[PDB]
């Protein structure tokens, strides 16, 4: 019988059973409906399949199951979809977010400095949640002492988006938005004005197709970047850098061999898949790996799901950094494969070299059984994570 959950129920994915329950969507009822009648899709394969058919399976309708659409890009279709991206794309070009190693990585050793000398530190609040926050905070132009404000404001629009939030939550994202969109706006008007190079100057400039994107525009995309750049990053280093600890082969093979970083941080991506699933609307009524679909409901692409398919990844409840191929999804697939790829990686990358070359001892104080998940049904992963290591001194 099939396993009895409720897909947009965020405990369920604070579950360290919920991979036994995509195990058994896999297998007998691919794409799966839920206790309430929730469709989704939990093999590589239909998650593919539905990517690559984006007029049956749109984002327009938004990207949670019981929340309408935003104008921000990822709740739009091609071709409007296209000139938006395009658009924001100036933020996020390749040699862009190359030229801030520097910067990400003098950030990973300022926050390493603050905690290498005491032999242990909360690896989720002292190092993995501050370096993404910190960085986008950067491009953003957020008083380094204002940046934990910002993280709080991203905590409260990420939590919305997690759950169906009672009017007392629902009315704290409307603040925490408000204040965004304060922010976002003085940004805007001051660097129309006096442009610098920070991220909202080079938005401004950008023109694609004679288009250039609005103020509206600007406070919403750069919104779906921040809870981008300072929610989702934050999981990967953690769980990853955990498996790490939790298979000291793998941490000796990476501590000894820099050039496997690479394909470390693809498995940290694959394992972690922080978020848990993205929402497409059916545009018609179709038969889809074997389950009837109608119109106008929403169907979960379960990233997680695909990313622990054994028709694609040999016994994928090993984790490898030698993995080859790789092709996770993570990130997604298709038109709305994630636009900041690269920077997470590179901020993955930057973080993880630092940790293992200055923290080299490092170990976990307790097993994954008692630190808890999230609870939250799209984006999730530890709380806490506890680490001890040998002490050292600053770099300063
Ligand atoms: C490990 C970190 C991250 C993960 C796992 C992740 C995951 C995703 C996923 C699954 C999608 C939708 C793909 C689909 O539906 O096929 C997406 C889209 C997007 N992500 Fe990320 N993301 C991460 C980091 C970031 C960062 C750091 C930024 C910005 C700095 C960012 C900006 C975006 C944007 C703008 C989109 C919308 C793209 C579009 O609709 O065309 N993401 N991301
Ligand atoms: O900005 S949004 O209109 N929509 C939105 C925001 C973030 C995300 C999460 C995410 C983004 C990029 N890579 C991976 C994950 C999804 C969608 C919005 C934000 C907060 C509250 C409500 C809506
Ligand atoms: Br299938
Ligand atoms: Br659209
Ligand atoms: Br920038
Ligand atoms: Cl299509
Ligand atoms: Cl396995």
Known sequence: EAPDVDLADGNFYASREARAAYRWMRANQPVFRDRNGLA???????????????????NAGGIRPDQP??????????????????????????????????????????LIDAVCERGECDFVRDLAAPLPMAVIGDMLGVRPEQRDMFLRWSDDLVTFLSSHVSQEDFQITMDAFAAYN???????????ADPTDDLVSVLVSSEVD????????????????????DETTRHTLSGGTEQLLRNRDQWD?????????????????????PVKNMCRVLTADTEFHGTALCAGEKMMLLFESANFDEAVFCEPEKFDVQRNPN?????????????????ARL????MTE?????????????????????????????????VVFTPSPPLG
């Open 347 to 350: 901020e993955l990358s930057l």
């Open 210 to 229: 004679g288009e250039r994107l609005s103020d509206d525009e600007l406070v919403m995309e750069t919104l779906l970047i921040l809870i981008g750049g």
């Open 69 to 110: 659409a935003l104008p921000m890009m990822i709740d739009m279709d091609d071709p409007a979809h296209l000139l938006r991206r395009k658009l924001v794309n100036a933020g996020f070009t390749r040699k862009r977010v190359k030229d801030k190693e520097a910067s990400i990585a003098a950030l990973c050793d300022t």
């Open 253 to 273: 093979l990476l501590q000894r061999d820099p050039s496997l970083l690479p394909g470390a941080i693809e498995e940290m991506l694959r394992w972690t898949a």
């Open 182 to 192: 304060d922010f976002t706006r003085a940004t805007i008007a001051a660097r129309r």
């Open 354 to 386: 630092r940790v293992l070359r200055r923290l080299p001892d490092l170990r976990l104080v307790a097993d994954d059984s008692v630190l808890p998940l999230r609870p939250a049904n799209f984006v999730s992963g530890l709380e806490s994570m506890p």
């Open 40 to 58: 989704a899709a939990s093999t590589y394969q239909a998650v593919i399949d539905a990517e690559r058919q984006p007029e049956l399976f749109s």
């Open 327 to 343: 092709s996770h999804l993570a990130f997604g697939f298709g038109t709305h494969f994630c636009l900041g790829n690269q920077l």
